[PDB]
Amino acid sequence: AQYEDGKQYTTLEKPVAGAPQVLEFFSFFCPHCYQFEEVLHISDNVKKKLPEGVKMTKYHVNFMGGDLGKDLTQAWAVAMALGVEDKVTVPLFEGVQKTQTIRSASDIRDVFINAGIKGEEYDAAWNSFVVKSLVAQQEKAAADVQLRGVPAMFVNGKYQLNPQGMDTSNMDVFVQQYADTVKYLSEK
């Protein structure tokens, strides 16, 4: 065919019931994730091709960057709770990978302050039980597909995007092929 299991995607031999429709995993420590967000705008181009009613989920992971990795998963939980994903994603990536000015939870906090979230409300979110269960969700979803690498995308709890099986000569063409694959899998 044109889309083949093992080629643009793989199939989970252990499918995950009740999973988010489009589920993306990343780490602010992850170099291809930086590309995916900053150069390729994968998430955004996928959304643009997704059908009516399809919700998109993105979670952070713990298995990169040790102690700071976990802080970043909690901070992403804070970002999701406050709905400020689009204001911190770029400075977190650049603070971790470009300028390397993020070395502690306090430096992560600074990024939110500079993006205009108030100290009081950041610290309240950070310590909140709603953020705790939001961290729990991120971990459980990763555990469900027994995730050992990022970037990763899963469709309908049963298909996993396979970007190595796509041409990378042209970055634009790579993205469209990627988003079209997500759309195809979505309609399966």
Side-chain angles (χ1 to χ4, degrees):
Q2 291 276 352
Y3 293 101
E4 302 162 356
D5 177 356
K7 184 58 190 172
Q8 296 104 320
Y9 65 108
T10 54
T11 308
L12 300 184
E13 60 180 59
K14 251 255 188 63
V16 167
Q21 304 161 280
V22 181
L23 178 61
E24 202 173 329
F25 292 98
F26 81 109
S27 171
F28 286 111
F29 278 93
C30 159
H32 287 137
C33 302
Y34 188 110
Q35 295 298 308
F36 264 41
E37 166 68 21
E38 298 286 289
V39 182
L40 297 187
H41 307 286
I42 291 288
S43 294
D44 183 45
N45 279 268
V46 167
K47 167 170 196 146
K48 279 188 305 91
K49 290 225 177 150
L50 290 181
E52 256 148 13
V54 176
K55 82 171 318 293
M56 216 149 153
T57 309
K58 170 140 67 194
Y59 289 155
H60 198 268
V61 296
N62 289 342
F63 59 81
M64 295 191 78
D67 217 284
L68 250 193
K70 293 209 85 194
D71 280 325
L72 281 167
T73 301
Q74 188 160 351
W76 187 247
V78 173
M80 284 184 294
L82 297 181
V84 298
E85 297 95 330
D86 295 344
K87 304 171 175 195
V88 296
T89 290
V90 166
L92 286 171
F93 265 118
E94 299 196 348
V96 177
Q97 297 185 52
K98 194 181 171 176
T99 57
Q100 293 180 346
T101 46
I102 293 180
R103 303 186 229 86
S104 66
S106 179
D107 301 334
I108 300 170
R109 184 172 183 279
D110 285 345
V111 170
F112 285 71
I113 305 295
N114 190 47
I117 292 85
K118 279 158 188 179
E120 23 183 346
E121 93 165 308
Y122 179 90
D123 301 339
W126 181 268
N127 286 302
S128 73
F129 286 85
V130 176
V131 154
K132 281 199 206 318
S133 53
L134 226 41
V135 165
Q137 287 170 230
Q138 293 182 89
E139 296 186 16
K140 178 175 174 291
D144 287 344
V145 298
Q146 185 167 3
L147 185 69
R148 82 198 138 185
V150 285
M153 189 179 294
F154 297 88
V155 176
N156 277 167
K158 214 175 170 126
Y159 302 108
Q160 178 182 356
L161 275 288
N162 187 53
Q164 74 283 9
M166 314 176 183
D167 197 337
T168 59
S169 51
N170 183 296
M171 308 196 88
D172 299 323
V173 172
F174 170 73
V175 176
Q176 286 332 311
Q177 187 182 355
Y178 194 100
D180 290 344
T181 301
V182 175
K183 183 179 191 282
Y184 160 78
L185 293 175
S186 195
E187 293 164 357
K188 226 170 155 79

